[PDB]
Design a protein around this ligand. Structure first.
Ligand SMILES: CCCCC/C=C\C/C=C\CCCCCCCC(=O)O[C@H](COC(=O)CCCCCCCCCCCCCCC)COP(=O)([O-])OCC[N+](C)(C)C
Ligand SMILES: CCCCC/C=C\C/C=C\CCCCCCCC(=O)O[C@H](COC(=O)CCCCCCCCCCCCCCC)COP(=O)([O-])OCC[N+](C)(C)C
Ligand SMILES: CCCCC/C=C\C/C=C\CCCCCCCC(=O)O[C@H](COC(=O)CCCCCCCCCCCCCCC)COP(=O)([O-])OCC[N+](C)(C)C
Ligand SMILES: CCCCC/C=C\C/C=C\CCCCCCCC(=O)O[C@H](COC(=O)CCCCCCCCCCCCCCC)COP(=O)([O-])OCC[N+](C)(C)C
Ligand SMILES: CCCCCCCCCCCC(=O)OC[C@H](COP(=O)([O-])O)OC(=O)CCCCCCCCCCC
Ligand SMILES: CCCCCCCCCCCC(=O)OC[C@H](COP(=O)([O-])O)OC(=O)CCCCCCCCCCC
Ligand SMILES: CCCCCCCCCCCC(=O)OC[C@H](COP(=O)([O-])O)OC(=O)CCCCCCCCCCC
Ligand SMILES: CCCCCCCCCCCC(=O)OC[C@H](COP(=O)([O-])O)OC(=O)CCCCCCCCCCC
Ligand code: NA
Lengths: 513, 513
């Protein structure tokens, strides 16, 4: 039942449902930001509480409710006379819509604080899920302070126009909802880690921040204009600011917000193609704001420049290494054929994402993950070497750990006859061929997964011939061999005496047969 | 007594009181900067020395003292006639306030030069505190030159309006106080090192620098305007510059400073929404200044971009390593379950600030601090291993030096039965459990501080069973083991023969019992 379910329920913060929940809370938070400030400053978003009265010349000049032709080409700004009921009779639908969305976002906040109440914390690697423990951890922490301050329903009594007590509402009392920024920061970071484009996403959330700052600065500009007085000088929004209200432009709520947003965009991006301040207070406001806009522009430039620098760092490092090679081959007077070979191979493995090293896995991962990855890649290929057929899998784990990559280019010789042989080669991503002394392919091409040199790695007596390679091997195209050194194999064998017995016996039997 | 105290007193420059003193000296220095230049250029900050006379049409046009309605909508700039006593009778209170603050800051300078006189210097690690020595070091150095030049009381005779000799003061003679910038630079660096936000603090002191430069450039703009003549053209402050003095704006000292600061902000940030120069000298000034403003804007952008690049360097490096791992696991065709395991573990220790290495302590600290830190973390946990109970603490210091961290993820196996055992594990930050061959937890979970494998690390004969693990151990959650290799223990033991005897005896006794 829902009773027992909500009685015993606890939350795990690392789920995929909890991430979606943090996204929902972020939606509610953005709602609060934008529309609390907008409803405070503009306050026609809920419907006008007052009636705009314009002085109109019909017979004679009288004061009547402004039409849209009275709000165009104004010679003075209209005056307002409140309604008896502060617009409630004719805008109750707009105000009920606003109340519904406020209640929806506060229900989101209540669900979020319930999930914080029953919140599983990580103790000794595990996530604790015993309710008693999570609620005790909640109460011992001071999360309930922030969860309660951010939900104080003060804006439901004093945030709306009450005509009985002649109270015209204070929508700014909902700014305590903006204290739950911790879950928004988590959602943004958990989205950055999941994003297939983290640099782009970082710059995108920065421009979202800048757009929200432009919105708040637009509201600040219009609040300062309304406090000073609209149409009083050529800087505040009004009829004397001929950029606010040009010739055939009507003074509407959309016009107020649109011009304020444009003004704020021009100021905070340091473009400044807006009217100059007139009064000392406007000069102070605009100076401070232009300094904030210099800092905002510098922040945008810095974030975009950091993104550009990060996304071109690998190419830069590759170019540095290639230029070092070029400079060396010029200082030491290297033949041009070898130089074009070097440059061809460099460009080849730059157009194939190779990095020439297992050092990423080696450095950054723990030995457990490194061993598991090496076992996945190399074990089933090292189980078919015909000397490792019946030896302990721990030996093969040790070996698959010590497998060194070697790359080759077309026509390169892996080994020539009469050439000390201290190695075993496992073919990946290529095709070798054994040749009769720079002649025709004699017997076989080595496709992927094949091995060559598995018997020149054991120290058997006499054999038939030295520690000399005895065969020619050249790559047809670009091969990617994996190399098992002799010292590494013999270390792993000194760790395993019975494996050494089996290996030596099988090698001797292979050579005799 | 104060006599003996000041006779024998010497100063240690590394105290917390001396840092507060450098902050006081920085306050005095900033006072000098701002208000010496402001009092030179504007010089109504001490009270007007002259009387502004306006041509006023009452009956007829006469020249009378300007009111505030005569300084609005001016058709020409007012003319000035000095007082007999240069405003002293009616502004002696303002001038006495200025004199008091000047004397206060010069007392700060005198205390500072006394502390420089009795200044303890660092000689052979210690701070010398013998007065004779510190005063001899002061006199042998040439600090007294700067301490004396910066305190020359020339501005007390020639810096104020003297009506007897018709001298109107030269407040710029106090610019020698601006030579003590060394203590200001120390205070700023000592505050940067103490600051919990060094990047933010660096950018903040840079914007303080920019605000001071804007202040000095505002004073320079108004001094050039006054030298050319006020109201002579449409670039200098005055009545022909309709941005300085719009319609209903009064010409006051506040207006002069406010407009000059706004002009300087627009010029030095390369916004340039100010009137164009009219004369060749104004063109030269504005060109040079706009070039300085280009450099200032580039400096702001560079500092903010450097702060942004520094504070996102760890995330960038982590992302580079994770992308390298992804690219490797795509090139080698790794199973997707292992890839989601790898990514989960990566994100886990990126959301826990782990860094997987003790290499910070290893690289950057001296062996003394490294040994002390390792002793604090590991000694009391290595004293309870039941083989290290009665062995020399030097052996255990050697050991706590060589303890390697190993991390594990939930369900990972630390060791399986029949698995070469060359190691000892010390549990931290996790909980293991021994299991009956992938079945149920058999006997015990290993909470933190527990040890496993302490007997598979000694080379005792026969024992009961090999060097084989003999037990299964898997982590319940994310465990953080500490690993004591066999080679390291046996090196530390070869350094200690008696410790080896005790260890082998106790191991044999443990196994027999
Ligand atoms: C989104 C839209 C939702 C549904 C309807 C929006 C109605 C658009 C306004 C109608 C024009 C009235 C007008 O024109 O503006 C005003 C002001 O009212 C408004 O702005 C209300 C705007 C918003 C209303 C409700 C929005 C609630 C939305 C919830 C927030 C969004 C949540 C995000 C989701 C999580 C009414 O003017 P008036 O004709 O009374 O005054 C002048 C008459 N003289 C000049 C001719 C004489
Ligand atoms: C936005 C909706 C666009 C409405 C377009 C047509 C309405 C119309 O066309 O009606 C407008 C009247 O105002 C309105 O009710 C529209 C209400 C929209 C007010 C915008 C205030 C928004 C504050 C929102 C915060 C936003 C967060 C943004 C963060 C970046 C009359 O139009 P008029 O001035 O073109 O001339 C008429 C002759
Ligand atoms: C800070 C404030 C400290 C206390 C008082 C400040 C008084 C404010 C000025 C009164 C308005 C007079 C006026 O309005 O401006 C002027 C100029 O005098 C001043 O500016 C003096 C400003 C500063 C005075 C003393 C400041 C000493 C502060 C020490 C520095 C701060 C140190 C930082 C701390 C380490 C007087 O004008 P008037 O009426 O004689 O001329 C026009 C008359 N017609 C037009 C109607 C005919
Ligand atoms: C600053 C104090 C604000 C005073 C506001 C009200 C005074 C007033 O309101 O009185 C002003 C008169 O000038 C004053 O004495 C105020 C003296 C302030 C002069 C500012 C010069 C400051 C140079 C300071 C260096 C500052 C370092 C800054 C570094 C970034 C009259 O006012 P009004 O022009 O508005 O019109 C009247 C009709
Ligand atoms: C730089 C200093 C700028 C001078 C600011 C100033 O003079 O105006 C004081 C304002 C009220 O001024 P007004 O609204 O009468 O023009 O009232 C206020 O100052 C509000 C407080 C913010 C300052
Ligand atoms: C006023 C200027 C502040 C603009 C605000 C832009 C902003 O908030 O983005 C900050 C970004 C990095 O943010 P984050 O990575 O900490 O989430 O980049 C920054 O941290 C730079 C902000 C500091 C500017 C001074
Ligand atoms: C670029 C060169 C710009 C030309 C400068 C110039 O012509 O004017 C010389 C000024 C005096 O000029 P004015 O005050 O008579 O206009 O007198 C001075 O030049 C002062 C010295 C600084 C130059
Ligand atoms: C004229 C442009 C000079 C602007 C002055 C801004 C400034 O002084 O800040 C300098 C900062 C670093 O200063 P600091 O770290 O040496 O204290 O950053 C710089 O060093 C850049 C100043 C050099 C600009 C050329
Ligand atoms: Na312009």
């Amino acid at each position: 039942r829902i009773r027992k379910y909500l009685a015993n329920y606890t939350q795990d913060p690392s789920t995929d449902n909890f991430y979606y929940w943090t996204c929902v809370v972020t939606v509610a938070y953005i709602y609060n930001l934008l529309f609390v400030i907008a409803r405070q400053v503009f306050n026609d978003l809920i419907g006008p509480s007052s009636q705009s009265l314009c002085r109109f010349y019909n017979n004679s000049t009288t004061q009547v409710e402004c039409t849209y032709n009275m709000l165009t080409n104004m010679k003075e700004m209209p005056t307002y006379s409140q309604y008896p009921d502060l617009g409630w009779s004719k805008y109750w639908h707009f105000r009920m819509l606003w109340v519904f969305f406020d209640l929806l976002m506060d229900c989101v906040y209540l669900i979020d604080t319930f999930l914080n109440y029953r919140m599983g914390y990580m103790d000794q690697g595990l996530v604790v899920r015993e309710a008693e423990k999570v609620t005790k951890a909640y109460w011992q922490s001071k999360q309930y302070r922030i969860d309660g301050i951010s939900l104080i329903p003060l804006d439901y009594i004093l945030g709306w126009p009450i005509p009985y007590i002649n109270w015209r509402g204070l929508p700014i009392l909902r700014l305590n909802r903006l204290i739950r920024y911790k879950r928004v920061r988590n959602c943004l970071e958990r989205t950055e880690t999941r994003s297939s484009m983290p640099n782009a996403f970082r710059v995108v959330v920065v421009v979202w921040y800048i757009v929200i700052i432009i919105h708040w600065n637009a509201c600040l500009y219009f609040w300062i204009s309304e406090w000073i007085g609209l149409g009083t000088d050529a800087w505040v929004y009004g009829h004397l600011n001929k950029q606010s209200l040009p010739d055939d432009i009507t003074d509407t709520l959309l016009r107020r917000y649109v011009y304020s947003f444009y003004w704020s965009t021009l100021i905070l991006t340091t473009i400044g193609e807006v009217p100059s301040p007139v009064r000392n207070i406007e000069y102070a406001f605009v100076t401070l704001d232009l300094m904030c806009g210099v800092l905002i522009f510098a922040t945008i430039v810095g974030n975009v420049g950091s993104m550009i620098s990060n996304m071109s760092a690998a190419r830069t490092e590759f170019q540095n290494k290639m230029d070092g090679i070029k400079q060396y081959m010029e200082l030491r007077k290297v033949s041009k054929q070898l130089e074009i070979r070097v440059i061809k191979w460099f460009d080849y493995l730059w157009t194939n994402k190779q990095s020439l090293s297992d050092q990423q896995v080696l450095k950054v991962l723990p030995d457990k993950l490194q061993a598991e990855i090496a076992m996945q890649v190399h074990f089933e290929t090292l189980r078919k070497v015909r000397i490792f057929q019946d030896c302990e899998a721990g030996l093969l784990a040790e070996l698959v750990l010590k497998l060194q990559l070697q790359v080759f280019s077309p026509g390169d010789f892996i080994c020539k006859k009469g050439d000390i042989g201290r190695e075993m080669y496992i073919v990946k991503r290529g095709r070798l061929q054994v040749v009769d002394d720079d002649g025709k392919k004699v017997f076989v091409t080595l496709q992927e997964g094949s091995v060559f040199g598995e018997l020149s790695i054991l120290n058997i007596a006499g054999s038939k011939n030295g520690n000399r390679r005895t065969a020619n091997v050249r790559s047809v195209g670009y091969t990617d061999l994996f190399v098992l050194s002799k010292t590494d194999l013999w270390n792993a064998l000194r760790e395993y005496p019975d494996a050494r017995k089996l290996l030596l016996a099988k090698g001797r039997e292979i050579l005799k047969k």
